[PDB]
Amino acid sequence: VIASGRLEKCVVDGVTEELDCQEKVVVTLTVGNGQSLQTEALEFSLAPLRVSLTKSPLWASYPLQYLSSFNWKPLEVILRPSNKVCKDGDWEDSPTCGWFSQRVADSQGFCCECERTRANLDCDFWSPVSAHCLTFDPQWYSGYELGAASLQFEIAITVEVREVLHLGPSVPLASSASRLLSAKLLGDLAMYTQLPAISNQVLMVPQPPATNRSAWMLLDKTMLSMDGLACDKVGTGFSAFRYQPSGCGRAPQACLSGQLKDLWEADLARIADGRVPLYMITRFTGGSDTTLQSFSGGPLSFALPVTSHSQSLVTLSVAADGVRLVTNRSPGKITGAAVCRFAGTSCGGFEAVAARGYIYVNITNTGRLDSDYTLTVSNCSSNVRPIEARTLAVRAGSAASLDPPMELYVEDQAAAAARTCTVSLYDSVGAVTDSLTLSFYTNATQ
Amino acid sequence: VIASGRLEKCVVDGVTEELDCQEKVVVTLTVGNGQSLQTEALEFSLAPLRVSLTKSPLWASYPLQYLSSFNWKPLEVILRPSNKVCKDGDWEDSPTCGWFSVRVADSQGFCCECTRANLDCDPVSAHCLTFDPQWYSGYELGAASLQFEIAITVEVREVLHLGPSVPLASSASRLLSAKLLGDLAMYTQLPAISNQVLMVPQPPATNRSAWMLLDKTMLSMDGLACDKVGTGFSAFRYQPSGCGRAPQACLSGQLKDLWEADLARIADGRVPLYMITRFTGGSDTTLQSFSGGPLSFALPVTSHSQSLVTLSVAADGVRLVTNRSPGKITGAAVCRFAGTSCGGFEAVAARGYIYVNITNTGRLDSDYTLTVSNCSSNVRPIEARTLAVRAGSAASLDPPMELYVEDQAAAAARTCTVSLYDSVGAVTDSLTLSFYTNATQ
Amino acid sequence: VIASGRLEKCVVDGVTEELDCQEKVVVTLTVGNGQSLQTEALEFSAPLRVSLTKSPLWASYPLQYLSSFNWKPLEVILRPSNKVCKDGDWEDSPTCGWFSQGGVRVADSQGFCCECTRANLDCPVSAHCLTFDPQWYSGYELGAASLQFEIAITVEVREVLHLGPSVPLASSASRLLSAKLLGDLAMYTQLPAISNQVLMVPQPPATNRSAWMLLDKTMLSMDGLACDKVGTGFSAFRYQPSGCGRAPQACLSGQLKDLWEADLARIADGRVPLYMITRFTGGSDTTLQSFSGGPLSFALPVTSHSQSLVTLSVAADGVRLVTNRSPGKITGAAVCRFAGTSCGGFEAVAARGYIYVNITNTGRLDSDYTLTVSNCSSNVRPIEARTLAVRAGSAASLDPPMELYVEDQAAAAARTCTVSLYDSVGAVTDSLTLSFYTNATQ
């Protein structure tokens, strides 16, 4: 809650010209990112009017715009005619490879005469030409250019006298009313940790025919041959495969590296070495795809869960005169805390600089009331990148955890086994419990 | 308005050391993006002091920094010597193509004997790089800075403006001193253009219409790569195949090819990828309204950015007076980029543009809120809009509301509820109907 | 200060179920980016003196190591004299000799031979070998910026109790007073788009962060398959398009050294560098050195306003605001090129000016000041105001200078701006800067 007060709100009617003045109670208040429970309420004297606010989980949705389709892994098929006649040139009546149709330009591959190299392979003692044709993997992906992030949430105002009524201000519905009470969402304050710079990257969704969004990849424009003219880029086509620099003096599948498959396989290898993948959309979550699945949007939508604080400003205008704030102050306990690698490869520590840790913390509301809690990773040892605090609305008696874990970074590529952090837990002003995490960080390799 | 109150503001003078305490009325209040009219006012009791705030149209300006010049469409020119002698190599003083000037490296082009070489068989030929007369200057865009101005009209016939803005965070007028704290975060973030290269045609059409904004991936800055906006003499000569490649082989994907490809996108009811009009929705007129100089670039801000202004008045007592004029939605349509057609768009591969005409059906200039809510399945939510409309007069959303679908499904009965609110309650609502023909490819 | 008021704050205990209501004074206030000094204070009724200060704001970007990169790979041309150059794969004794990095023979490290630009020089054979500069660099992919600061809330009864709410510690308390940092408002000038670029730190073994570069992903061959990029290998150097028909160092352009040198040439022509991390500051590396983080950290000083919202809850009933209002004087103002190449002006559009302003607190009290560059001539890009907390009698300056831009590539020598200095509401002095802009070349 920002500040309460009394003000005479006058309304000069647009048609009648008559002004109607009524003294109202104008209360501006803060609604946190993780304020998903009925912890606090406001009581207005008019019998008291109980008003309580809750904010849905915040999401940063990016609009999709289809660009082109990209194949999972194109392949070179070396055809040896046996009749020793290969003629695959431009404006050719009948090439060995044959034209690809949706006649696609430069889809006829190339001929080569006499690791080994396209030409060197043709040289058989027993036999002297061969065609090199581009073929596509049965699986295709569709490339979508992500747009600008827009914060998607919903604020639920539960007005009660008796009979209860729910008001829903949000981003598309900034204002809401119910005769005695009219509330307006002004907007929220800036996030301390900005969103990832993914507002221009290309999202790779597999064209149908394991989990919804698990196979998805997000690629930088630097790794894509959009025109299909560059070599060894996601989208290298027939025009790039044919006309490649050396051609016959290069090993087969030469211009076919750096494809979706290759990048996917490379990312698996990164996860295996306890390093964060570079292309898999799970790089933002921390390993699990389940976090993203919880998003409300349609099949072709992309949104990341927001972990940074975004305090929404809501102004309430009540005809009632007098206000009181009532808040639940239930104690808590940290029922576990561990620093683990990407996708829970291992625990206890990570690789300095070349990788990052993920702080998973289990907490428990040790009371009879549903209360809001604040988890802080402070008083850390040398060269540890500070982590922004977290809010947790936890139900009475029940236990909770940070679904997207807190990312952990080190500002030195040093080898260590005794690195520490102080995991504090606060409830509605004062600290209820604290533990001391211990992370190891095996020095950066290369 | 955030919250009003009374506080004793004491000032310990820096030279005299004497403290001067005066009880003042401290009022913090928002100022919306589209609050360009005198709708609401504040009355302070000291005869009432009428104070009213307005915010100019918001713009996100990006600073320009010249990098290099880029040609419109470099062309390959094929010369057949007839004397059957092609002289084009490094150190050779009289090449067939001739050096470009002093002597630019690899400008001599290249030779092909017996696609380029296949054509010669009718016998050597010379392939020379030539440039289009039109050139464009490349400017690297910097970081966006929100540009606006808040006008505070203090009145007790005597009216006094006060202009707090981004370069002038504070303002005063003896009895009243106001400070712009800053505005809240936009719900829809700005487009990621803070590093792209702006292509302005070098002089010697409309002001900013010919302009293009290109990603750094589509520019060969060193002029060594092929088929990029910046590829030069050194790239044309030394191309992968060379003679075995068709004429105009290294010269694809230039400013002309990108512009041409973009007009084709608009034609197929798809948003262009390079034209600066991709942010507006078709019209260049929206951008022309920007205050800046010839070499400036700014995009109109459509997301809400509620500015926080704190007023300190020596007067004791405050009242808020607001105009509540009704409105009417005098039209609503979902149309393609640059008004190609209306009624619908192409699912995912394109986007719709909601154009809404409204009318202030009253005697007072009032603020209105337009919302596109209660939409059908897989429709991407659209953030609300504010409209300060003069009495009796009609208005429209100049930059239209962008419309997206979260499925590449073929549909003809897609719906949205366009509600119009005036200073708390809904005065009218319509029901838009969009068709989305499924994504092709 | 936003708004003060009185409210009954009730606490329903989670275990005892008993509600405890206490009427408190709830004050929401604003702490500026450059509010480092004790200028203003709050007096709660013997008065309780409470004063807020905000540390210098920084935008830190998390590092993630990608790969290592050499300073300037060099081509060493060897002419064997015995006229025998045989450098191919699987040959045990090549002229260049194999490179060993993992105790094993690195592929394509043998270079290439040329008979009778690389072959024109020989005029009968020669070897072309790739060698590395002793200096190596480490490529780190920058992550998303996170604002790093600390708010210090001094409480005085007697006893000096100092509270520290910040980004990792949003809340703080001290029995009578409990404060919460809600968050700060959005910056008018957004941060530079560096959240995806690759930071080049030289591998150890002149100044900490001076040699550092920040490169766009377009300028690196990560797979090492492209020619003339920051990352082109032995493999890229060999198998190059022409080879023997191209001048030495043909596939070794645009390396770290090459870019660095190009940037010194830009600074020399009074233009802002494109790769040097000093492009954000204004020339000096000293500004960045002041950052609290570890050796492998990167943060830029925030010059745009970021007003933090802090709400104070005191059991005391009654509040008064006391502020120091010391006058000031602009003791110099100049528009200078990057890294102070020259002064008086800059190059229109192709470059930018840097407004350096010296100010002086001409009073007995430490006070907060506002510096504004307003009422400027035609086609001058507006500059956001600055806050300065200056100690009594002492002089101060804008450490990161105000960037100056022109919205026309016109030649002008009489361009003007009105530099105004405000102190805790009213303007105490004003000068009139005069910049020259020599028109854009090319």
Ligand SMILES: *[C@@H]1O[C@H](CO)[C@@H](O)[C@H](O)[C@H]1NC(C)=O
């Ligand atoms: C948290 O609890 C889950 C079960 O809910 C358990 O599997 C996990 O090991 C716990 N982690 C920590 C850090 O306590």
Ligand SMILES: *[C@@H]1O[C@H](CO)[C@@H](O)[C@H](O)[C@H]1NC(C)=O
């Ligand atoms: C809005 O009104 C203009 C004329 O004022 C008209 O050209 C346009 O078609 C109208 N559009 C809608 C959606 O009503």
Ligand SMILES: *[C@@H]1O[C@H](CO)[C@@H](O)[C@H](O)[C@H]1NC(C)=O
């Ligand atoms: C500011 O003062 C320093 C010395 O304190 C001097 O070196 C510098 O040139 C001055 N600059 C201006 C613009 O007054």
Ligand SMILES: *[C@@H]1O[C@H](CO)[C@H](O)[C@H](O)[C@H]1NC(C)=O
């Ligand atoms: C990281 O360091 C710890 C230190 O106890 C362990 O030894 C662990 O095995 C190290 N990891 C690697 C991959 O060497």
Ligand SMILES: *[C@@H]1O[C@H](CO)[C@H](O)[C@H](O)[C@H]1NC(C)=O
């Ligand atoms: C989009 O679908 C609607 C469905 O009624 C129309 O038939 C329209 O013609 C379609 N557009 C195209 C280009 O096929």
Ligand SMILES: *[C@@H]1O[C@H](CO)[C@H](O)[C@H](O)[C@H]1NC(C)=O
């Ligand atoms: C910039 O223009 C002014 C105009 O008076 C000066 O002549 C100055 O010498 C110019 N700079 C250059 C490099 O020509």
